[PDB]
Design a protein around this motif. Structure first.
Motif, PDB file in Angstrom:
ATOM      1  N   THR A 179       0.847  -1.198   0.000  1.00 25.31           N
ATOM      2  CA  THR A 179       0.000   0.000   0.000  1.00 25.31           C
ATOM      3  C   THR A 179       0.883   1.249   0.000  1.00 25.31           C
ATOM      4  OG1 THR A 179      -1.635  -1.191   1.269  1.00 25.31           O
ATOM      5  CG2 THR A 179      -1.895   1.194   1.209  1.00 25.31           C
ATOM      6  N   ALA A 180       0.764   2.074  -1.035  1.00 22.29           N
ATOM      7  CA  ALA A 180       1.673   3.171  -1.277  1.00 22.29           C
ATOM      8  C   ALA A 180       1.719   4.161  -0.120  1.00 22.29           C
ATOM      9  CB  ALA A 180       1.327   3.916  -2.564  1.00 22.29           C
ATOM     10  N   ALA A 181       0.577   4.545   0.450  1.00 24.82           N
ATOM     11  CA  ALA A 181       0.610   5.525   1.563  1.00 24.82           C
ATOM     12  C   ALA A 181       1.371   4.929   2.777  1.00 24.82           C
ATOM     13  CB  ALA A 181      -0.779   5.958   1.957  1.00 24.82           C
ATOM     14  N   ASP A 182       1.184   3.637   3.017  1.00 27.10           N
ATOM     15  CA  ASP A 182       1.814   2.941   4.128  1.00 27.10           C
ATOM     16  C   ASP A 182       3.332   2.797   3.974  1.00 27.10           C
ATOM     17  OD1 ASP A 182      -0.640   2.693   5.481  1.00 27.10           O
ATOM     18  OD2 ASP A 182      -0.915   0.622   4.790  1.00 27.10           O
ATOM     19  N   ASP A 205       5.302   4.895   2.113  1.00 30.91           N
ATOM     20  CA  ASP A 205       5.774   6.267   2.272  1.00 30.91           C
ATOM     21  C   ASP A 205       5.826   6.713   3.735  1.00 30.91           C
ATOM     22  OD1 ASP A 205       6.241   7.033  -0.418  1.00 30.91           O
ATOM     23  OD2 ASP A 205       4.035   7.431  -0.698  1.00 30.91           O
ATOM     24  N   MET A 206       4.718   6.565   4.451  1.00 32.09           N
ATOM     25  CA  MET A 206       4.605   7.082   5.781  1.00 32.09           C
ATOM     26  C   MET A 206       5.492   6.297   6.760  1.00 32.09           C
ATOM     27  SD  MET A 206       2.787   9.835   5.420  1.00 32.09           S
ATOM     28  CE  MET A 206       2.553  10.098   7.192  1.00 32.09           C
ATOM     29  N   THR A 207       5.575   4.976   6.573  1.00 32.68           N
ATOM     30  CA  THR A 207       6.372   4.123   7.430  1.00 32.68           C
ATOM     31  C   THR A 207       7.867   4.413   7.282  1.00 32.68           C
ATOM     32  OG1 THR A 207       4.664   2.453   7.475  1.00 32.68           O
ATOM     33  CG2 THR A 207       6.872   1.746   8.122  1.00 32.68           C
ATOM     34  N   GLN A 213       9.228   7.222   6.031  1.00 30.34           N
ATOM     35  CA  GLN A 213       9.423   8.608   6.507  1.00 30.34           C
ATOM     36  C   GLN A 213       9.553   8.670   8.039  1.00 30.34           C
ATOM     37  OE1 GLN A 213       6.533  11.507   5.008  1.00 30.34           O
ATOM     38  NE2 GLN A 213       6.744  10.744   2.934  1.00 30.34           N
ATOM     39  N   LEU A 214       8.675   7.978   8.739  1.00 27.62           N
ATOM     40  CA  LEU A 214       8.672   7.991  10.209  1.00 27.62           C
ATOM     41  C   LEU A 214       9.952   7.408  10.787  1.00 27.62           C
ATOM     42  CD1 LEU A 214       7.304   8.527  12.986  1.00 27.62           C
ATOM     43  CD2 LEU A 214       6.128   6.358  12.705  1.00 27.62           C
ATOM     44  N   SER A 272      12.938   9.640  10.087  1.00 23.24           N
ATOM     45  CA  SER A 272      12.903  10.736  11.026  1.00 23.24           C
ATOM     46  C   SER A 272      13.419  10.320  12.456  1.00 23.24           C
ATOM     47  CB  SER A 272      11.480  11.262  11.075  1.00 23.24           C
ATOM     48  OG  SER A 272      11.383  12.334  11.946  1.00 23.24           O
ATOM     49  N   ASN A 273      12.924   9.186  12.965  1.00 27.53           N
ATOM     50  CA  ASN A 273      13.329   8.699  14.300  1.00 27.53           C
ATOM     51  C   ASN A 273      14.813   8.337  14.294  1.00 27.53           C
ATOM     52  OD1 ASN A 273      10.820   9.104  15.554  1.00 27.53           O
ATOM     53  ND2 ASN A 273      10.092   7.108  15.060  1.00 27.53           N
ATOM     54  N   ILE A 292      -0.779  -2.309   8.530  1.00 24.79           N
ATOM     55  CA  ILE A 292       0.024  -1.383   7.758  1.00 24.79           C
ATOM     56  C   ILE A 292       0.646  -2.227   6.679  1.00 24.79           C
ATOM     57  CG2 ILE A 292       2.052   0.128   7.723  1.00 24.79           C
ATOM     58  CD1 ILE A 292       1.463   0.833  10.572  1.00 24.79           C
ATOM     59  N   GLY A 293       0.239  -1.991   5.434  1.00 24.34           N
ATOM     60  CA  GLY A 293       0.570  -2.875   4.324  1.00 24.34           C
ATOM     61  C   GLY A 293       1.874  -2.489   3.665  1.00 24.34           C
TER      62      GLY A 293
END
Ligand SMILES: *[C@@](O)([C@H](CC(C)C)NC(=O)[C@H](CO)NC(=O)CCCCC(C)C)[C@@](C)(O)CO
Ligand SMILES: [Cl-]
Ligand SMILES: [Cl-]
Ligand SMILES: [Cl-]
Ligand SMILES: [Cl-]
Ligand SMILES: [Cl-]
Ligand SMILES: [Cl-]
Ligand SMILES: [Cl-]
Ligand SMILES: [Cl-]
Ligand SMILES: [Cl-]
Ligand SMILES: [Cl-]
Ligand SMILES: [Cl-]
Ligand SMILES: [Cl-]
Ligand SMILES: [Cl-]
Ligand SMILES: [Cl-]
Ligand SMILES: [Cl-]
Ligand SMILES: [Mg+2]
Ligand SMILES: [Mg+2]
Ligand SMILES: [Mg+2]
Lengths: 220, 248, 237, 204, 230, 233, 196, 234
Positions: free
Chosen positions: A48-51, A53-55, A57-58, A61-62, A94-95
């Motif tokens: 899943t593209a949003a998952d 990207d967001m995963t 990125q997070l 960042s951490n 979270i795919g």
């Protein structure tokens, strides 16, 4: 999606296609699937593209917060742990299916990470709907301790196998080469697919479209 | 722990709230800040305290804040406390716009913030905010408006008013010169400079030392502008030309 | 969260915070109420004058609902909190009972809010007294008063704020069947009561009326100075 | 399908130093037209617009909640939002509802407030962003829209040709979709002006 | 539980004395200097470094917040580490939402807001530090100070800590608008030399710079080079 | 300054002792229990002729079989009275029977020492109640009068006065009370005693009186019924 | 089953609603009123699920009245419509959604008459005329056929009556009487019920 | 002084004045006596009446079929603690279908009452209890204090002038184990009577009695029901 990675003599080669789909329609012809984690660590994403990207990125960042604190270059194990512990906590909802590669103080490391939170540390991996095509290339042709150019050839061959044999995969081949000395983010590496040319011209002159109402608002 | 609690939210024997009164002493020492309402607009003019040679100049003002499309404010008192309140004003204004799909009327924004200030005087055992504010705005119910609020959570509407250093003197000068129903932005500007010229009596007045913002209406839209230094020096020139006329 | 006990007993049974809240009310502007036969009237002092004030923004008389209003004396910020709480409560009553509140119902509510702020951790008492007026369903006129303790009573007429003692004395002598036989005289009785204590009479009396079913009318300075002259020229005789 | 309950279509398109955004005008509930002037494209700046197709209630909620966030951003920062930054803000807003999403898939069209460079993007309902150099489409006739755009779009079009292309792409696409149409609105965004037109269109 | 009452309150004269006293902790701290040149910013500080026994490299006073923002302070070191940690976290939270590095002024506003909290919130004292924050964004350098009240200011050049009043007048008679970064580094080190006492080495001062390429600490060898002239 | 739950060297809670002193600032109330019913009588204490006397309510119905007279800080009594009312209705709801006078008094008395500033909810009770209460009613035990004060101590009494003049009034009650006394005698006796102790001249508007009898529900005396009883007194 | 209709002219909005409360196979009330007065110049017409309809409308009503008491002046029709919408949309994904369909009619001193349509999902549309219920399927085309923006209030009542007569002829439900009201500069006026 | 307002403040002598002050609440209550034989546990209490026309305060409370208490000190604290005891007994019957052993209940009281003696802004319980019970280990008399300490007793008296009662109980305690019930209650009454001013005597108005034993659930005797026990103090 076809994503893949290999450990070669001096580093990691990551690879990806550039198609994103919505159902059985191409939504993006040039999606970037190889994501920055840290200067020495990158991660391909499938699912899943949003998952993805967001995963990524997070975690990136951490990890930057981590390295700012330690004053040291991050480790691939640390990205792996952070990703898998978060994905496990979300129970597969979270795919994100990931190919994580980098080079740290202990050398090159490559991991596949699955949505439910399992990880496998291996010298070559593939993921996505093209992953079996890409894996066939690797099983047939991988050798340990390849030179940079051999490894790059092999990864792009594997991505190409997915591009041409999986309806979910397409367009360009991107590679990322990571060693102790160098990071080469090669986007695109190859462009094996090209839209055919237009034979007739449909340049519609002003007034072709009938207009009911018009308002011009001037700006500064 | 009862020994260390200074008990900021209790009454004194005469029905007074000491922390509120003390916060009001802080405000009296801060930069003078005035507001003047006219027929065609409203203005804020403020003494700058950020005036050392080595300061850099990065924002469009020091003490004038835009709150939403139709409103601005200025502040006198503790600056960090002002930053908290003005952030909260912006939030309240967007919450209203979200809910009703129209701008918050001016008095409603002021009242909402005053209820927060009031709470800090009545419960929670915290120090109050050390800030007074002047608010300028336009809405469709009462047009051009000027409000003042203080750390008690009290407010009022004014045709003209002043907070901060030398407030009392400033208000006397306004009482005498302000023409109810007959002021323009151009004459309110003249009067603002007259008043600051007398109340910045340490010492000679300069464009580097004041900040002026105007709020007007143009083609169905509110325009809020901070005057450039060129314009401020021109108004100071005109006031000084004008005082040359004062006798013969 | 801050849980200090603020209002506590002292030796001899005093609640000092409440006594100090009452000192706050005594320094507020004078407010007066009289219950007429079929009108109720509220008038209040001053406070400052000040030519540059927008008058609308500082009224001390407030609608709670269509059939109930109030005046207060004391801390004006505190009053605004109480008023808004009572306005919310009037809408709950309408919602769940499908009648407007009685004046006694909303008084009882305001009083118990005040009482709670004399017995709850972390809070000081409200520094206000209120005069609450209006009409019940059956047309009966009402005047109630609340104070910072949460005590409340009904009155024929009353004053709170600075000079309440002497204004109450005046009302005790001047409140009769004759003085409230009509609407004009009821209104005058309130103005006379104020004009005793009111500094530069007056000028700065704010005044409002409520008639049976007719909702709150505030008087303007022109309508007030009509009454002022109409009483002042009568007091020469 | 939740996304087709109201129907609707938006698209955006890039030209030389200009961008275009267009939408159909129908508000309907399954087969029934309710109104023919429903707004789907919203100003987010002088030269920056967002178009939303999908469930009409979420079109409105997302536009409104986005505007709340943008207004606060602009007051706090010195300045007008950049197109790429608006995209990110919207992505973040949609992904906050990852597990109970808003049913809307926006397109953004604008010019950078300082450089005036053209920008277009779209996002899926959970906030995945896609920037392109040509066009983006969203709504119940996306296949129709892709077929028109792929065949007609050319690079470096001037404002007049951009207008004709986006208009012909929209009209002909929605004419193959039962639940989109009842009118088309088109905004052309240039450095020095916005031009807003409604098109002569089928009303069946 | 936590004390829920403020430990900073107004005195009869309208002062928040705990904040004043926090400023006295700053004034007694080691000197820090910041100079905004035309093409960058320099931050410099003295180590309150006694012993040869200290490993000078083990903790830094000049710290990166992001690729493009850095910090130094005067006052209490452990309080500073709190603010460094929160600033880094604030910068990342911004980046996750906006996908753009936090503008220097936005970072200062958020950090200053944390400092304000500790002047009002229950059962805590204010921070005994003032921060100098440098950055580069919109093609241009920024220098800010944030004080224990949560007030912040933009400076062309300034000094804080011990002997700061003098340091400010030293810079007043020495800074110009058109100055380059390499010249600015030199005048920053001279500003510290005004109040040094000890003989300067590359091991007891720390220097950070900010330009278009980003924020970084100068290395011991680079500082040694600048010290040869001084 | 010390906390609200501090014991004195004599083993008493300061706050409770101080609340007991607040009862002495209240108007006098009297309760008498006879075999024919209980009566409750209270001094209104009118402070202005402009005040409406019927708005002073120092005797209230708890339920049909139970009334309550109060003295001290009257505003404090409201939550106690409401708790008594709610409890008797809960008991009816649950058990389909009337709650005893003793049980009502007990339920209210369990609120008494529930104050303090670091066990409880965000804004719980900061101090005790400055109120004393007489509960008079009839249940299957017959007529009953109970007294409660701010310590949460409650007890049955044959006759009891509370408030400003309770010493005084209690002495006259010892003198006149007898176990076989009629209700009409008890009513007269309590008005005679109120008349002695009141600063104002007793009349039919500045006192209240109520009864509860085995036959008959809680009954507040009207102006006209008070005037009748006042003639002899 | 419930019918609402609104018709906006140049300086007024006309609205009507059936007066039936039904349950299973029976009409249980024939003089039911589906209109809620929000303010002097605002009506909210509400239909949908039992309980939800009254609970939702009365909550909106009390808050609109509260706004008046707090501020000294009324919400505009448009502000009230957006307030109504914010509440419905905010509840949509909560534990307490309200299954209601609405019309909001009003007159603003400065903006003139307004009619707003809202469905249970909380999509809000301004319209020159509108209707809710199964009866809308048989009457919207009659409105499209004969409505003009300058329609006088007499003719609006005639147009309304054509719609209501069509329900008598063609609709399977027995809806024999309707409440009719109009809003203009002078507030809310009750017209005679239209009955069959 | 600076050491006497908070239960959390140790004095420099290793004492906690707030606990000592709470114990004064019990010393000022009216006296109560508890004693036991091989087969029964008895409580005897003097009841104080405010005026000549008041009933006399309850001093003896039912906890469970096998347990009752006598109280001295703050009545509201006595009820709170009695309600805790009742609930602990109900829990034990619910879970285990058997009576809560008396010594375990007393432990629970010790643990509950200790907690507020160690936390700021809390106070000790201002009540002392005599606890009479019967279980598998026979009859018991326990005493509990505001300090949260408790004691297992052959017999005990607490409250005002209880020193006299304690002196009587020491003098005769070698007789208690072999006493019949009537003899044992008489001993309780004579001990309690030592606490009284020389003028005054035990009456049916001022004495309350509680008894539990092998064949007898916890029973309270008041008013006319105490007369059998008072006649023949011969
Ligand atoms: C890939 O796994 C691809 C990877 C993704 C990171 C681009 N996945 C997708 O395209 C998925 C498959 O469902 N699609 C989406 O998440 C919908 C959003 C796409 C629209 C743009 C806004 C990104 C493959 C093998 O699934 C591609 O077919
Ligand atoms: Cl691992
Ligand atoms: Cl805005
Ligand atoms: Cl706004
Ligand atoms: Cl409350
Ligand atoms: Cl008063
Ligand atoms: Cl939001
Ligand atoms: Cl605390
Ligand atoms: Cl850190
Ligand atoms: Cl960053
Ligand atoms: Cl660095
Ligand atoms: Cl008493
Ligand atoms: Cl006792
Ligand atoms: Cl007690
Ligand atoms: Cl002990
Ligand atoms: Cl003892
Ligand atoms: Mg179509
Ligand atoms: Mg059609
Ligand atoms: Mg439901």
């Amino acid at each position: 999606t076809t994503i893949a990675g290999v450990v070669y003599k001096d580093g990691i080669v990551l690879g990806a296609d550039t198609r994103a789909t919505e159902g059985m329609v191409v939504a993006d012809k040039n999606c970037s699937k190889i994501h920055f984690i840290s200067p020495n660590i990158y991660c391909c994403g499938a699912g899943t593209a949003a998952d993805t990207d967001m995963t990524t990125q997070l975690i990136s960042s951490n990890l930057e917060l981590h390295s700012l604190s330690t004053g040291r270059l991050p480790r691939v194990v640390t990205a792996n742990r952070m990703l898998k512990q978060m994905l496990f906590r979300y129970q597969g909802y979270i795919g994100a299916a990931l190919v994580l590669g980098g080079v740290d103080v202990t050398g090159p490391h490559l991991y596949s990470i699955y949505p439910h939170g399992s990880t496998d540390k291996l010298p070559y991996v593939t993921m996505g709907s093209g992953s079996l095509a890409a894996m066939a290339v690797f099983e047939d042709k991988f050798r340990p301790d390849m030179e940079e150019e051999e490894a790059k050839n092999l990864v792009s061959e594997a991505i190409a196998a997915g591009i041409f044999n999986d309806l979910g995969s397409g367009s360009n081949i991107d590679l990322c080469v990571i060693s102790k000395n160098k990071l080469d983010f090669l986007r695109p590496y190859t462009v094996p697919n090209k839209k055919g040319t237009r034979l007739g011209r449909y340049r519609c002159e002003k007034g072709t479209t009938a207009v009911l109402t018009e308002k011009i608002t001037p700006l500064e | 722990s009862r020994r260390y609690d200074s008990r900021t939210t209790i009454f004194s024997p005469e029905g007074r709230l000491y922390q509120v009164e003390y916060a009001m002493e802080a405000i009296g020492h801060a930069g003078t800040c005035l507001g003047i309402l006219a027929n065609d607009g409203v203005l804020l003019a403020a003494e700058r305290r950020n005036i050392h040679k080595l300061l850099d100049e990065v924002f469009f003002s020091e003490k004038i804040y835009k709150l939403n499309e139709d409103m601005a404010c200025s502040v006198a008192g503790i600056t960090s406390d002002a930053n908290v309140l003005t952030n909260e004003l912006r939030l309240i204004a967007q919450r209203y716009l979200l809910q009703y799909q129209e701008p918050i009327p001016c008095e409603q924004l002021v009242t909402a913030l005053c209820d927060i200030k009031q709470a800090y005087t009545q419960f929670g055992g915290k120090r109050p905010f050390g800030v007074s504010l002047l608010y300028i705005g336009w809405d469709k119910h009462y047009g051009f408006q000027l409000y003042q609020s203080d750390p008690s959570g009290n407010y009022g509407g004014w045709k003209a008013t002043c907070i901060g250093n030398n407030s009392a003197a400033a208000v006397s000068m306004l009482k005498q010169d302000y023409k109810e129903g007959e002021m323009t932005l151009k004459s309110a500007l003249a009067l603002a400079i007259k008043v600051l010229n007398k109340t910045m009596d340490v010492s000679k007045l300069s464009a580097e030392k004041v900040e002026i913002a105007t709020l007007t209406r143009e083609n169905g839209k509110t325009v809020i502008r901070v005057l450039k230094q060129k314009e401020v020096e021109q108004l100071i020139k005109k006031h000084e030309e004008e005082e040359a006329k004062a006798e013969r | 969260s801050y849980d200090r006990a603020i209002t506590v007993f002292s030796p001899d049974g005093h609640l000092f915070q409440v006594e100090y809240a009452q000192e706050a009310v005594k320094k507020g502007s004078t407010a007066v109420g009289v219950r007429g036969r079929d009108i109720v009237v509220l008038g209040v002092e001053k406070k400052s004058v000040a030519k540059l004030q927008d008058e609308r923004t500082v009224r001390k008389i407030c609608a709670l609902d269509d059939n109930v209003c109030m005046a207060f004396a004391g801390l004006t910020a505190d009053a605004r909190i109480v008023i808004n709480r009572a306005r919310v409560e009037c809408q709950s009553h309408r919602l769940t009972v499908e009648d407007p509140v009685t004046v006694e119902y909303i008084t009882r509510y305001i009083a118990s809010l005040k009482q709670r702020y004399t017995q709850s951790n972390g809070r000081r008492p409200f520094g206000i007294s209120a005069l609450i007026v209006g009409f019940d369903f059956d047309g009966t006129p009402r005047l109630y008063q609340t104070d910072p303790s949460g005590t409340y009573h009904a009155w024929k007429a009353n004053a709170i704020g600075r000079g309440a003692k002497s204004v109450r004395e005046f009302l005790e002598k001047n409140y009769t069947d004759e003085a409230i036989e009509t609407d004009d005289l009821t209104i005058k009785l309130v103005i006379k009561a104020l004009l005793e204590v009111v500094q530069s009479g007056g000028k700065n009396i704010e005044l409002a009326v409520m008639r049976r079913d007719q909702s709150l009318k505030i008087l303007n300075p022109e309508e007030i100075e009509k009454y002022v002259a109409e009483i002042e020229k009568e007091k020469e005789e | 399908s939740i996304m087709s309950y109201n129907g609707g279509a938006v698209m955006a398109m890039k030209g030389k130093n200009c961008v275009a955004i267009a939408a159909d005008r129908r508000f309907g509930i399954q087969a029934q037209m309710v109104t023919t002037d429903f707004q789907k494209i919203f100003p987010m700046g002088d030269r920056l617009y967002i178009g939303l197709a999908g469930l009409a209630t979420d079109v409105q909620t997302v536009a409104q909640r986005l505007k709340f966030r943008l207004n606060l951003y602009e007051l706090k920062e010195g300045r007008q939002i950049k197109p790429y930054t608006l995209m990110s803000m919207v992505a973040n807003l949609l992904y906050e509802k990852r597990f109970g999403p808003y049913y809307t898939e926006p397109v953004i069209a604008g010019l950078d407030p300082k450089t005036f460079k053209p920008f277009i993007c779209s996002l899926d309902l959970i906030g995945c962003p896609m920037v392109t150099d040509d066009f983006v489409v969203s709504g119940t006739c996306a296949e129709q829209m892709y077929g028109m755009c792929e065949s007609l779009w050319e690079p470096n079009m001037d404002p007049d040709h951009l207008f004709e292309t986006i208009s012909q792409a929209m009209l002909n696409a929605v004419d193959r979709d039962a639940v989109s149409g009842m009118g088309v609105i088109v905004h052309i965004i240039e450095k020095d002006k916005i031009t807003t037109r409604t098109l002569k269109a089928r009303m069946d | 539980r936590g004390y829920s009452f403020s430990l900073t309150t107004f005195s009869p004269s309208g002062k928040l004395v705990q904040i004043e006293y926090a400023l006295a902790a700053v004034a007694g701290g080691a000197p820090s200097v910041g100079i905004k040149a035309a093409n960058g910013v320099v931050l410099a500080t003295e180590k309150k470094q006694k012993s040869i026994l200290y490993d000078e490299r083990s903790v830094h006073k000049v710290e990166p917040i992001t690729k493009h923002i850095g910090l130094v302070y005067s006052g209490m070191g452990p309080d500073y580490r709190v603010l460094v940690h929160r600033a880094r976290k604030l910068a990342q939270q911004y980046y996750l939402v906006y996908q753009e590095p936090i503008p220097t002024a936005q970072l200062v506003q958020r950090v200053a807001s944390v400092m304000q909290e500790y002047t009002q919130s229950g059962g805590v004292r204010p921070f005994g530090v003032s921060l100098l924050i440098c950055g580069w964004n919109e093609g241009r350098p920024y220098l800010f100070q944030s004080d224990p009240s949560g007030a912040y200011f933009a400076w062309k050049a300034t000094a804080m800590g011990k002997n700061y009043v003098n340091g400010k007048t030293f810079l007043e008679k020495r800074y110009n608008e058109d100055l380059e970064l390499e010249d600015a580094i030199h005048t920053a080190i001279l500003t510290l030399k005004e109040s040094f006492e000890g003989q300067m080495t590359e091991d007891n001062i720390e220097v950070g710079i900010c330009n278009e390429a980003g924020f970084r600490r100068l290395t011991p060898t680079e500082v040694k080079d600048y010290l040869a002239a001084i | 300054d010390r906390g609200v739950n501090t014991f004195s060297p004599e083993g008493r809670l300061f706050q409770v002792e101080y609340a007991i002193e607040a009862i002495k600032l209240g108007s006098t109330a009297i309760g008498i229990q006879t075999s024919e019913g209980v009566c409750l009588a209270v001094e209104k204490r009118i402070t202005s002729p402009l005040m409406e006397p019927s708005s002073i309510e120092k005797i209230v119905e708890i339920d049909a079989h139970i009334g309550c007279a109060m003295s001290g800080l009257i505003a404090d009594a409201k939550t106690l009275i409401d708790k008594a009312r709610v409890e008797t209705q809960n008991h009816w709801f649950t058990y389909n029977e009337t709650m005893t006078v003793e049980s009502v008094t007990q339920a209210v008395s369990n609120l008494a020492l529930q104050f303090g500033e670091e066990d409880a909810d965000p804004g719980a009770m900061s101090r005790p109640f400055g109120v004393a209460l007489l509960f008079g009613g009839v249940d299957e035990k017959g007529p009953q009068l109970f007294h409660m004060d701010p310590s949460g101590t409650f007890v049955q009494c044959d006759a009891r006065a509370i408030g400003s003049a309770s010493e005084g009034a209690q002495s006259s009650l010892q003198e006149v009370y007898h176990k076989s006394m009629t209700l009409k005698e008890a009513i007269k006796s309590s008005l005679i005693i109120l008349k002695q102790v009141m600063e104002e001249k007793l009349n039919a508007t500045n006192i209240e009186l109520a009864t509860v009898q085995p036959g008959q529900n809680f009954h507040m005396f009207t102006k006209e019924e008070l005037e009748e009883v006042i003639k002899d007194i | 089953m419930e019918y609402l209709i609104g018709i906006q002219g140049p300086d007024y909005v006309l609205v009507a609603s059936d007066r039936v409360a039904a349950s299973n196979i029976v009409q249980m009330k024939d003089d039911h009123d589906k209109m809620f007065k929000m303010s002097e110049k605002i009506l909210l017409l509400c239909v949908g699920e039992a309980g939800d309809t009254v609970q939702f409308a009365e909550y909106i009503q009390k808050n609109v009245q509260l706004y008046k008491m707090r501020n000294g002046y009324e919400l505009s029709p448009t502000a009230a419509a957006n307030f109504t919408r914010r509440n419905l949309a905010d509840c949509l994904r909560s534990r307490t959604p309200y299954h209601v369909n609405l019309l909001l009619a009003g007159y603003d001193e400065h903006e003139g008459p307004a009619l707003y349509y809202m469905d249970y999902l909380a999509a809000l549309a301004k319209a020159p005329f509108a209707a809710h219920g199964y009866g809308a399927f048989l009457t919207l085309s009659i409105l499209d056929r004969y409505y003009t923006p300058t329609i006088s209030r007499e003719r609006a009542v005639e147009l309304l009556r054509k719609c209501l007569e069509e329900l008598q002829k063609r609709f399977i439900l027995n809806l024999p009487t309707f409440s009719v009201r109009i809003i203009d500069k002078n507030g809310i006026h009750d017209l005679d019920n239209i009955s069959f | 002084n600076q050491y006497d307002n908070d239960v959390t403040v140790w004095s420099p002598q290793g004492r906690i004045h707030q606990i000592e002050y709470a114990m004064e609440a019990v010393k000022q209550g009216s006296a109560t006596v508890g004693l036991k034989s091989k087969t029964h546990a008895v409580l005897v209490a003097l009841k104080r009446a405010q005026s000549e026309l008041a009933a006399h305060q309850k001093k003896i409370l039912h906890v469970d079929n096998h347990i009752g208490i006598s109280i001295a000190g703050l009545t509201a604290d006595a009820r709170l603690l009695c309600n805790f005891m009742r609930q602990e007994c109900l829990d034990s019957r619910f879970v285990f279908d058997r009576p809560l052993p008396v010594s375990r209940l007393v432990s629970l009281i010790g643990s509950k009452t200790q907690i507020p003696t160690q936390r700021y802004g809390r106070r000790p319980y201002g009540v002392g209890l005599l606890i009479a019970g019967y279980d598998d280990m026979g009859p018991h008399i326990f005493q509990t204090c505001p300090s949260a300490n408790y004691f297992d007793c052959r017999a005990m008296s607490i409250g005002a002038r209880s020193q006299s009662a304690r002196t009587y109980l020491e003098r005769h305690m070698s007789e208690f184990m072999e006493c019949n019930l009537n003899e044992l209650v008489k001993h309780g009454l004579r001990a309690l009577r030592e606490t009284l001013p020389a003028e005054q005597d035990l009456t049916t108005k001022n004495v309350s009695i509680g008894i539990v034993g092998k064949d007898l659930e916890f029973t309270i005797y008041d008013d006319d029901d105490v007369s059998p026990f008072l006649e023949g103090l011969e």
